[PDB]
Amino acid sequence: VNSFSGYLKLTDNVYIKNADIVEEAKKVKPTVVVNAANVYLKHGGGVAGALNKATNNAMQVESDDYIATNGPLKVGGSCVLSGHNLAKHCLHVVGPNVNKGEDIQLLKSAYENFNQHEVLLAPLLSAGIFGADPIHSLRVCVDTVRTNVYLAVFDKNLYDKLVSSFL
Numbered sequence: 450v451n452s453f454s455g456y457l458k459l460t461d462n463v464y465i466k467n468a469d470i471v472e473e474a475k476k477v478k479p480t481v482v483v484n485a486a487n488v489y490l491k492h493g494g495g496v497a498g499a500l501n502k503a504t505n506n507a508m509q510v511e512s513d514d515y516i517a518t519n520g521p522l523k524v525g526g527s528c529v530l531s532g533h534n535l536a537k538h539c540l541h542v543v544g545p546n547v548n549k550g551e552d553i554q555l556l557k558s559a560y561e562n563f564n565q566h567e568v569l570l571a572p573l574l575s576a577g578i579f580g581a582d583p584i585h586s587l588r589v590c591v592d593t594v595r596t597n598v599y600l601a602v603f604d605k606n607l608y609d610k611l612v613s614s615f616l
C-alpha cells in the first residue's frame with residue numbers, strides 16, 4: 450500500500466492522474482519524483498521549470514554543481530539528485546526533444562531509467578515542450594517500465610484523451 454490517491458490504474462504497474470506534478474509531490478513526498486530534464490540540467494520551463502521554481506531555485510543550484518563536476522547527461526540518460534522539499538530524490542531523466550531533432554527511439558532508453566526505482570511519481574517523458582506525441586510516450590512507458598509508476602498529466606484535456614485512447 451502507498452499514499453498515491455485518485456489514480457486510474459492502466460496496467461499492473463502504471464497509474465495515471467490529471468494533476469500538477471508539483472502539487473502532487475508536495476502532498477505525497479514520494480521517494481522519487483522524475484524531472485523532465487535536459488542534458489545541461491537547465492530547468493527553464495515545462496515540468497523542469499515548475500519543479501525548480503517550487504524548490505526556490507535550489508534544484509538549479511545543485512544541478513549546476515553536478516554539471517560542473519560531471520559534464521552533461523546523455524539523451525536517454527539520468528542522474529539522481531536531491532528531491533529538496535518535493536521528494537526524497539529527484540531522478541532527472543532526459544527524454545529526446547523533438548524540437549531539437551533528437552531520435553525518438555531514445556524514448557525507450559529514457560524510460561528504462563525508471564526501472565532502477567521501485568516506485569516513482571513522473572511526467573510523460575518527451576511530452577509538452579519536448580515535442581513528442583504524449584499518446585506514444587504513454588505507450589512506451591507502459592511497454593518499458595516494470596516498476597510502479599504514478600503519472601501526473603497537467604492538462605485535463607490531454608489526460609482525458611490519454612485515458613480514452615489507451616489500449
Ligand SMILES: O=C(Nc1ccc(C(=O)N[C@@H]2c3cccc(O)c3C[C@@H]2C(=O)O)c2scnc12)NC1CC1
Pocket residue numbers: 468469470471472485495496499572573576577578583601602603604607608
Ligand atoms: O506546471 C506545473 N506542473 C507541470 C508542468 C508541466 C507539465 C508538462 O510538461 N505537461 C505536458 C504538457 C504541457 C502542455 C501541453 C501538453 O500537451 C502537455 C503534455 C503533458 C501534460 O499535459 O501533462 C506537467 S505534468 C504534471 N505537472 C506538470 N505546476 C505549476 C503550478 C503550475
